[PDB]
Structure formats: structure tokens, C-alpha cells
Design a protein around this nucleic acid. Structure first.
Ligand SMILES: [Mg+2]
Ligand SMILES: [Mg+2]
Ligand SMILES: [Mg+2]
Ligand SMILES: [Mg+2]
Ligand SMILES: [Mg+2]
Ligand SMILES: [Mg+2]
Ligand SMILES: [Mg+2]
Ligand SMILES: [Mg+2]
Ligand SMILES: [Mg+2]
Ligand SMILES: [Mg+2]
Lengths: 90, 80, 80
RNA sequence: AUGGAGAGUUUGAUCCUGGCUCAGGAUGAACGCUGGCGGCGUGCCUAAUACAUGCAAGUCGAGCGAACGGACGAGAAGCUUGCUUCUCUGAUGUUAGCGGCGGACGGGUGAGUAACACGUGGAUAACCUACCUAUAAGACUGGGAUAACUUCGGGAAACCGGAGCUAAUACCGGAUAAUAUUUUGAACCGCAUGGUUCAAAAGUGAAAGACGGUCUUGCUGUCACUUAUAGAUGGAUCCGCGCUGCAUUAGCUAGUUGGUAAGGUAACGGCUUACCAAGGCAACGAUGCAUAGCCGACCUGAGAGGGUGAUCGGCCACACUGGAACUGAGACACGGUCCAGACUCCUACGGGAGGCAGCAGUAGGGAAUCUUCCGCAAUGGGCGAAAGCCUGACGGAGCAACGCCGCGUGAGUGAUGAAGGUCUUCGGAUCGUAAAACUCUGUUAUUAGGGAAGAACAUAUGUGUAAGUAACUGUGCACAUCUUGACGGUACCUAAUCAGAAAGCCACGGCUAACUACGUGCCAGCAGCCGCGGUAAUACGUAGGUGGCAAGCGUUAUCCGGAAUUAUUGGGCGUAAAGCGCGCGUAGGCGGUUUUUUAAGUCUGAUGUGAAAGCCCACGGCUCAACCGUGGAGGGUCAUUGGAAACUGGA
């Protein structure tokens, strides 16, 4: 189905990722529905994470499902709690 | 509601049944020279009552495919 | 070649056999009902209901699409 | 204002016209010579030729029967109490088969396609959509089979047939349940057809369990199941406009154009079929022929333009050739099926087997294009409750100066201008501060130690919290803990030793930077053009010297430039190439003055959109750069909507 996942960029031995909403059948570095953020694993010994809460929450509401690393990111940024809180509150 | 495209042209054929052919004239600027050149397209239109006649200005709106070649209907007759 | 493919061939055949039998039964019913309606037979309603039932069940099995089922049900039920 | 160079060659000389040629940039390049390293890329363009071999699609025991394995541990003493059997229990496990899901993705290729294929902008009151999310309502009651298995039989084989037996979240009946179907009431609404909403009947349509918790003559958690309605996603159709050469291709079409009715499709529709009519298309290029995947982009150019469509991303098409359907949410299906054909292979001659335009690799073709590698550690995908399994996707490694970028092959001092080579006016001049010598350095190299990031996790294990419950287990969420790296002991770092191992290529008459000697003598040869060479060649060949570049330098091929030589920007037609021999005129192009009006062109805004990557600009990260990342800016002949009205158009 619809998935929030990391698309690989950068160069050899220098990964950079864009956090994107994509259909699963889509190729990893191919067609996407929307980009929500970025993730840099190799940056300054601290993962650098940019995410749009408004976009991430809209997609999580509509049934988009994170890959495991993306879930960790949305947890680190606090989006996964917000999703739960609203959903329980609903 | 989203709006379907509407065109105005002169009826150039009324021979077919419940159908009129409308010639819509537009200008195409030459890519290099920049002069506008007159261009015409004949649009096959549905005229249920066979109301329109050759030489009358008509208003046509886009529709679902009504035939092999017919994609438009007659909204009104502007001039006769 | 591939193991799952070799299995898929068998399951297709079994599926095809069940599907063709059910499709035939529905096709007979619709035919029988249509004749009954046209002939104004006393069994018109009973036969039409059998047709609708078999058609409805066929749609759920995905032997036919719902839209076809609706078309067939409608044409029979308009007739009766 | 950021951006624009010319030169040679028609003559005795000249000005002009005019072609030809060159200096530049670019490449998936190839070839010749030569060759140190690193980073980041790129690498069958030709035969959509044929393909040996391995691998590229599985997974699920928490759907199911069955089989294997049989722990823990049951009995007798062979007097062997360490070895024994079936008279048992039989745990963690494992698998062939059934069933579910996946296999329609990912990966490859560009043959076909001149088309709504694609690009851009719209439409669907003519559509469809597994998994995912949300909400609501349910999951009741029965049945008959069949793999595996057992046995028999037929085949060379591939693989079939009979009998018997057996499960399921397999299959089937009935019940109950629709906004679905029919019919009848309304109400409101749009853009023809029509949309929407609310009532009353009629016919008709579902489902399923598994693994756990508990207070266990009944509740319940998770997952699975069914129906209805939305969302999300993906797909389908239609249309405006844009998108290719040839008229020494001018006519084309009969399901053809329209209508009617019916059938058919998710769906509109000649989509199809009867019937009726004679339409439809075409000089605004139909039809035919040739060629071609299209685009984002890419190369060039001051620009306008011109050329192109590798790598990467999007869309399309194809899967030995041709046809067809089946299964399915989705295929008319690369590693599925059926048939026909060609080819290859096996055979007991009866009959069978197969499809690298997946990754490697081989043969062939070619000027020419890589290893039959490692790992699922990362990212992504399938299956599963999950661990996990599968994954030639992908991450890495290998090979190749193929490209781009970076750094080397030493540095300082050095007249004593050594020797030697070359030239010479025999004075000398030049190679040349070059060398040697002396001192210094270690990029690199070598050797020896240390040694990243990339890793997030998932799971499991605690604690808390939220919803729900009688409660619990679970579930969501939050915070802790252990554990996981192919590359790889790689990058990088440190120390020790050593100028030691690390420069070639083309050119030097002019364009065009750089000349002499000798040999040769219209020969041998050179050559992009002007040309050069027939005895004192800065043009041949070699040598010395010099010039231009540098791990490259040259050559060839091809594209843009210069070429204002198709000229919109930006040329011409008395004598240079070029005014039809001349009328009458059709289409088309163009058109006097004023006022009023309109607003199609024009101008000025707003809104949506013109993917990402790229180009450009800025900033940040890699020791720098290349490269990587991020944010802007730009890119329409775009659509929609609001103004202005001089000019063009309309009235
Ligand atoms: Mg082709
Ligand atoms: Mg120019
Ligand atoms: Mg397949
Ligand atoms: Mg294959
Ligand atoms: Mg270099
Ligand atoms: Mg030479
Ligand atoms: Mg030009
Ligand atoms: Mg002349
Ligand atoms: Mg004259
Ligand atoms: Mg862009």
C-alpha cells in the first residue's frame, strides 16, 4: 500500500535519504507521492533529521505505513506519539 | 461542478442526421516569424432536432464520446 | 520451471473447472428466464428469481463483474 | 551592460560576389604512442543474433491432514546393568503435499509505434481499484468431497489411469444482511444525456478460523473473515494544444460518416451486428512512402537558433516468432498455460524437453564496451504474529586513463658557466642552474602499530502511559537494556627508512606559439587549405634547439560554432545566382479618416500547475576540487479568474 520510506541519495559510502511517501510497488529511487523530510545517518556522529509534522500526520491518518527506520525517525521527532494521542482521543 | 470547454463556430455541414459539423477558427503564431496564421478545426456536434443549418453561428460544449467522431453538443444558435 | 509456478498451473485448472460450471449454470438460468418472460410463462417470477440469485452469486465469486451482474439483473427485472 | 575576434585561397595587380578550408567546444568513442596514484562517475551504440553453466521468487506449522525425528523418560537382565526391544508417554524440531498470499512488483530491452504514443492543459453527469486506513453492521446453521497416503496398472522417459482412505482459514446448500436491481411517491439541483437526497414495496446477494488471557455451564486480546460507505493508492477513457521528412506521394474511405435498435465492455462509443441514409477526410497536406520509442534533459551558440535523446527519473512498448484465453484486484502474464512456426535437444520412434532484451559468462557480429565475485550489514520489496526466510533489487568488491577532478615524478643552494651533444664567422654560441656537489623533505612508496562513521534497528527483556475490559493477556504510544557490518582491518592516523622506483606525446612555411644542421633530391615522401620536394628544403627523414600540453598527447568519426553561406534577430534578385513573356482573376496576406462599443490579439495582476534530478545562484559537507546535500532562481505557445484599453481584430 502507501508507505513512508527512505529513498537513497548521496554517493558511494556517503548515504543521504529523503523521507518520502510512496506506493510500495514503486522503485526505491523512482516515482513518489510526496516528500516529507530528509535523514542523514553519517552526519557529524548525530543523525540529522528534518520532517514536516503536518505532512507526516496527514499521511499517517490516510493509511500510509512507515518502514521500521522511518518509524524510529517519527518517534524521535515526536510524530508517532501525536498520531497515537489524536487517534485515542478520536 | 467543473466546467466543460465551450467553442463558437459556423456550421459547415448539416447533411448527417442529428449531427452538424462546426468549423472553429483560431490563430497559430509561427514559432520563428511570430505572425499569427488562421487555422480551422471541424468539430462533429450532436444536434438532436436537426435545428441548425449550414451558415449559422453556433455554440458547442464538450461531451462524452457520442459517436466514433462526435465529442460535442450544440448549446445554442448564436446567429442564423 | 519455478516450483510455485508449477503449483499455480494446477490450482488454475481446478479454479477454471469450478468457474466454468458455475458460469454455465448462471448462463442457463438467464436464458431460461428470458424465454419464460418473453413467453409469459406461469413460472416467470420463479425463473427470473433463480436467474438473479445465480447472477448475484456469480458476481461475488468474481466470475463476472458487479456491473455486468447489475446489467443482467436489470434487463431481466425490467422485462418481468 | 557580464555577452559577439578572425584567417587562407579566383588576379599581373584591384575592389566585389562566391564557394571551399582552418583556429573552438563536445562525445557511452575507437585507434596510435605512452603510462604513477587517489576520489567520483561511465563502460555492447553493432546481431530484438544464438546461447553451455550457476544464480535472478518465494514465503507462511499461529490455516490443514500426514510423515520423519524421536528427547525427557517409561519395562526385562543379555548378568554386557549399558545396553535392550515394543508393551507406552511421547518435548523442542523438520519436511513432501493441500490451502493463503506473492509471483502483474522489482530487473532487462527499444523491436514495433508518426499514435492522444508522448509532453502540457483540461474533462469523466461514461469508469474500475487486492493490500493499507477509517467508520458502521455482522461472522448463524449444515453438508459432500479431494490431495498427501495405501495399492494396483500403463509408459524409454516426460508423466498418466483405476480402487481405497483423510483434513482445512479448501469447496458447497440454507438463514440473516445492502445506498447494489426493479417499481412507485416525492424535494432540490446541473452541463444535453442528466446529479443528489428522503420515503413505500418486490426479487436477490455474505462470512472463518487460528494462537493466547481470565474469575474459565463464558467473557475476552491479537491476527484473520464478510458486507456497506468513505479516504488513500493505482489504473482506464475522452478532449484543446504541441510534437517528422517527402507532392518526382492528390486524391482517400464503404463499418467507411451519421442515425435507429440490440448485443457487448469497468465504462462512453461502429466497440460490434442488423436496418436506414450518404455521408466522412483532404492543398490548414489527406492517402501513401521513408524514418523514429517520447519527455525531463544533453551538446553547441552572445543570443535567436542548430544538433541529440547514453548513463539517472517519468511515460509507453516488447519478452524465440505469431495467435489465444485461463487464473486473478490487477495479466491476455520475461524466468505461467494452450496452439501454430522456426531452431535446439532427448527417445525404446510411440512420444517428450526448451527460450539470458534478469546477473555473471560464452560464441558470433563489430573500430569497440567489464567479473561465470561478496553480502543481505544499509535502503527497498514479497511472505510471516514474529524471529526469520527469499531478494544478481540493491549495498559493496573486481576489470578498463573511458571521462572529470585532485596530487605526485622532488625542494633549496649551486659558475666552478665542468664533460658531452649541437651549431659556428673557429671568436665562440647553445643545451644550462641544467648537472655534479652540498643541504633538506616525504606527498607518494615501503615497512611496522593503531583503527571510524556507515547501526537505524526489528526482536526480546523491564517500566510507564493511552484505549478497551469485570479483570487479564495482548494492542498503540513513551523511556531504558542486550545484540547485528559484505565492504574490512578498508578509509584515516602515527612512526621509521629512502630522491630513491613514478614523462610521455604532438608540433615548430603561413593561419598558429616555437629554427637550425645534415641527409634526400618532383625521388623518397608531406599535406586541413594555400601548397612543399627536380642538389644551399625553417614544408620530406633524422639530429640539436624550441613551442604547446601533460598521465596524457595525437589521429579518425560525428554534432554545434565560426557560416549574416536559408539572413525573425540578420542577405539578396540592372550587369555577379536570382523578376514568371504578359494579362484576367480565386483563395490567402495587407489596407484611408473620425466616433461609439466590445475585448479575440495586446498589456497588467491573482490562483493552480509546469515531478524529482539537472542547468544557474547561494550556502553547507567531504583536507581541496570533482562530487554530495539543502534552499532559492528560472523554465508554457498553459489553464482559470480580475483589471487597462492605445494599437490590431469584431460590431
Ligand atoms: Mg525502431
Ligand atoms: Mg553566431
Ligand atoms: Mg512471470
Ligand atoms: Mg528468461
Ligand atoms: Mg589531470
Ligand atoms: Mg609529419
Ligand atoms: Mg547560421
Ligand atoms: Mg545574371
Ligand atoms: Mg518583366
Ligand atoms: Mg525541477
Amino acid at each position: 500500500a502507501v508507505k513512508i520510506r527512505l529513498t537513497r541519495l548521496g554517493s558511494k559510502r556517503n548515504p543521504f535519504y529523503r523521507i518520502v511517501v510512496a506506493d510500495a510497488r514503486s522503485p526505491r529511487d523512482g516515482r513518489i507521492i510526496e516528500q516529507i523530510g530528509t535523514y542523514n545517518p553519517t552526519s557529524a556522529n548525530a543523525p540529522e533529521i528534518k520532517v514536516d509534522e503536518a505532512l507526516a500526520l496527514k499521511w499517517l491518518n490516510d493509511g500510509a505505513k512507515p518502514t521500521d527506520t522511518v518509524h524510529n525517525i517519527l518517534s524521535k521527532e515526536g510524530i508517532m506519539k501525536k498520531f497515537d494521542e489524536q487517534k485515542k482521543a478520536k | 461542478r467543473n466546467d466543460r470547454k465551450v467553442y463558437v463556430g459556423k456550421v459547415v455541414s448539416d447533411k448527417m442526421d442529428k449531427t452538424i459539423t462546426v468549423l472553429v477558427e483560431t490563430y497559430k503564431t509561427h514559432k520563428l516569424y511570430g505572425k499569427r496564421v488562421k487555422y480551422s478545426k471541424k468539430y462533429k456536434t450532436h444536434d438532436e432536432n436537426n435545428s441548425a443549418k449550414l451558415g449559422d453561428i453556433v455554440k458547442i460544449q464538450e461531451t462524452r464520446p457520442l459517436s466514433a467522431t462526435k465529442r460535442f453538443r450544440l448549446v445554442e444558435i448564436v446567429e442564423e | 520451471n519455478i516450483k510455485s509456478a508449477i503449483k499455480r498451473v494446477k490450482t488454475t485448472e481446478k479454479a477454471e473447472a469450478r468457474n466454468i460450471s458455475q458460469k454455465s449454470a448462471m448462463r442457463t438460468a438467464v436464458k431460461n428466464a428470458k424465454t419464460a418472460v418473453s413467453n409469459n410463462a406461469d413460472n416467470k417470477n420463479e425463473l427470473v428469481s433463480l436467474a438473479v440469485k445465480l447472477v448475484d452469486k456469480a458476481a461475488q465469486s468474481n466470475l463476472i463483474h458487479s456491473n455486468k451482474a447489475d446489467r443482467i439483473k436489470s434487463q431481466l427485472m425490467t422485462a418481468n
